[PDB]
Amino acid sequence: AEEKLPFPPDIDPQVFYELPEEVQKELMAEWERAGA
Amino acid sequence: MQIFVKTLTGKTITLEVEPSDTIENVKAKIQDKEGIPPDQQRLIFAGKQLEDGRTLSDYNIQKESTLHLVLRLRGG
């Protein structure tokens, strides 16, 4: 949560948190495997 | 007629559709507007997380219904 995730480019947590967790959370796990 | 698919950056793709197109046709028009692979597209409408074998009429989607996009990243 140290903003270690792929921020700030390609996405913003105001253009993808506009969802149910069920797909924001998969994004939050997809970035973990993305290299983050 | 043309829906407003808001992408992961706040931009709004706008492309023509019909109640005889399908949820894979909207991804194919997005593949024209952005060149994004339908294999990573994850089109959504009010969070009713759309399918890939329906029609816009099947969801009472209108010509400016607005949608969202939340692509897959796969691994790299």
Side-chain angles (χ1 to χ4, degrees), chain B residues 31-44:
Chain B
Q31 185 159 37
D32 212 74
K33 287 293 194 184
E34 291 294 338
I36 292 160
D39 191 56
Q40 298 178 225
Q41 291 188 47
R42 195 176 185 172
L43 189 71
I44 287 187

Side-chain angles (χ1 to χ4, degrees), chain B residues 14-29:
Chain B
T14 312
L15 60 209
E16 304 75 50
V17 295
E18 300 187 82
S20 57
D21 290 318
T22 165
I23 302 297
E24 72 180 294
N25 270 26
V26 183
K27 301 170 188 173
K29 291 148 191 288

Side-chain angles (χ1 to χ4, degrees), chain B residues 5 10 13-14 17 19 25-26 33 42-43 50-51 58 62 65 72 74:
Chain B
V5 185
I13 313 166
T14 312
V17 295
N25 270 26
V26 183
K33 287 293 194 184
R42 195 176 185 172
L43 189 71
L50 303 164
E51 295 290 299
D58 194 82
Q62 310 302 315
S65 64
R72 297 176 66 205
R74 312 312 294 278

Side-chain angles (χ1 to χ4, degrees), chain A residues 6-25:
Chain A
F7 294 124
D10 302 299
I11 34 77
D12 294 279
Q14 41 249 233
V15 193
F16 89 82
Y17 280 167
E18 302 301 289
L19 301 174
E21 231 192 279
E22 176 172 68
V23 52
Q24 309 175 16
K25 82 193 315 294

Side-chain angles (χ1 to χ4, degrees), chain A residues 10-12 14-16 18-20 22-24 26-27 30-31 33-35, chain B residues 6-11 42 44 47 49 68-76:
Chain A
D10 302 299
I11 34 77
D12 294 279
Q14 41 249 233
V15 193
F16 89 82
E18 302 301 289
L19 301 174
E22 176 172 68
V23 52
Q24 309 175 16
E26 289 187 343
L27 241 66
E30 169 158 56
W31 291 355
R33 67 179 184 197
Chain B
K6 175 170 289 181
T7 199
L8 286 185
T9 63
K11 170 272 177 71
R42 195 176 185 172
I44 287 187
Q49 311 200 335
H68 292 98
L69 200 60
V70 51
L71 308 182
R72 297 176 66 205
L73 282 302
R74 312 312 294 278

